[PDB]
Amino acid sequence: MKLCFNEATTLENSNLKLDLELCEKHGYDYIEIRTMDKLPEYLKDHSLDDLAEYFQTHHIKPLALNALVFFNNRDEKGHNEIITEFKGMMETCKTLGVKYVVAVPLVTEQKIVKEEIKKSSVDVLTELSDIAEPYGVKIALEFVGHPQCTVNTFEQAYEIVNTVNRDNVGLVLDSFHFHAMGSNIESLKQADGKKIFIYHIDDTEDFPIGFLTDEDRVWPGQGAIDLDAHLSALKEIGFSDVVSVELFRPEYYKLTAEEAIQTAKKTTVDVVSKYFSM
Numbered sequence: 229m230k231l232c233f234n235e236a237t238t239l240e241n242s243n244l245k246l247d248l249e250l251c252e253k254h255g256y257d258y259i260e261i262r263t264m265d266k267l268p269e270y271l272k273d274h275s276l277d278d279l280a281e282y283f284q285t286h287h288i289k290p291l292a293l294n295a296l297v298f299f300n301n302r303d304e305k306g307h308n309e310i311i312t313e314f315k316g317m318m319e320t321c322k323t324l325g326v327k328y329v330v331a332v333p334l335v336t337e338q339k340i341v342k343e344e345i346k347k348s349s350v351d352v353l354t355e356l357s358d359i360a361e362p363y364g365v366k367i368a369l370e371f372v373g374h375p376q377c378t379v380n381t382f383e384q385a386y387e388i389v390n391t392v393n394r395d396n397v398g399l400v401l402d403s404f405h406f407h408a409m410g411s412n413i414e415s416l417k418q419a420d421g422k423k424i425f426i427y428h429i430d431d432t433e434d435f436p437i438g439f440l441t442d443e444d445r446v447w448p449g450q451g452a453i454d455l456d457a458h459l460s461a462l463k464e465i466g467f468s469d470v471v472s473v474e475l476f477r478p479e480y481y482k483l484t485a486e487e488a489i490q491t492a493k494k495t496t497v498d499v500v501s502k503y504f505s506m
């Protein structure tokens with residue numbers, strides 16, 4: 229299983245240029261690039277070709293672009309924003325050789341029946357799939373374990389992906405999100421491992437579901453998530469391609485970029501290697 233770094237982990241104490249240097253130095257195989265801040269920032273004094281050249285000349289590679297944000301249940305205008313951004317991301321993936329694009333469900337206070345959220349998510353993901361085919365890029369749906377996220381549990385997200393039924397549409401299994409709204413481990417055990425594109429590892433303080441937010445995450449193994457169950461299930465269903473460490477804890481932004489990157493690696497490797505050869 230390959231090791232990947234998610235820039236959220238050093239959101240406030242690093243930048244893409246530094247993340248690349250340190251992740252490369254510390255044996256990471258992949259990095260997930262943030263499109264809403266890290267990449268634009270990097271592009272202020274670098275070109276996409278510079279970045280493409282970097283990947284061509286170093287071990288580390290770009291696993292995915294992070295977040296086509298709020299793709300489902302949008303009005304005409306919002307849908308336009310989503311499609312326009314995804315089309316733009318396709319060009320970026322092509323230039324940098326990126327394999328995945330993570331998609332995040334709509335977060336809203338509006339109550340929408342599940343069948344409406346499903347129909348919209350399936351229709352939009354199918355449209356994104358159609359767009360991605362000529363680029364060979366795959367879409368990874370990351371359900372978010374938040375009470376205001378329209379798709380917040382594993383089974384709901386899996387049902388959507390299975391209904392889309394496209395080889396280039398899968399899931400991002402994030403341990404925190406799985407735990408955050410109480411997804412059932414049995415649902416994961418019965419899932420097709422091939423539909424899991426990316427595994428985001430993390431952990432969390434033991435607050436009840438509904439109260440949990442991303443700032444509550446802590447390093448893998450230092451929290452209350454039954455990671456043993458998650459890892460055992462992933463192994464059982466055949467997933468084993470990659471694990472990316474994603475944290476949003478303010479506390480860790482107080483560390484240097486390197487301390488965070490090295491700690492993210494050690495905690496992740498020490499937990500995951502008990503189930504997978506890395």
Ligand SMILES: [Zn+2]
Binds near residue numbers: 428
């Ligand atoms: Zn995640």
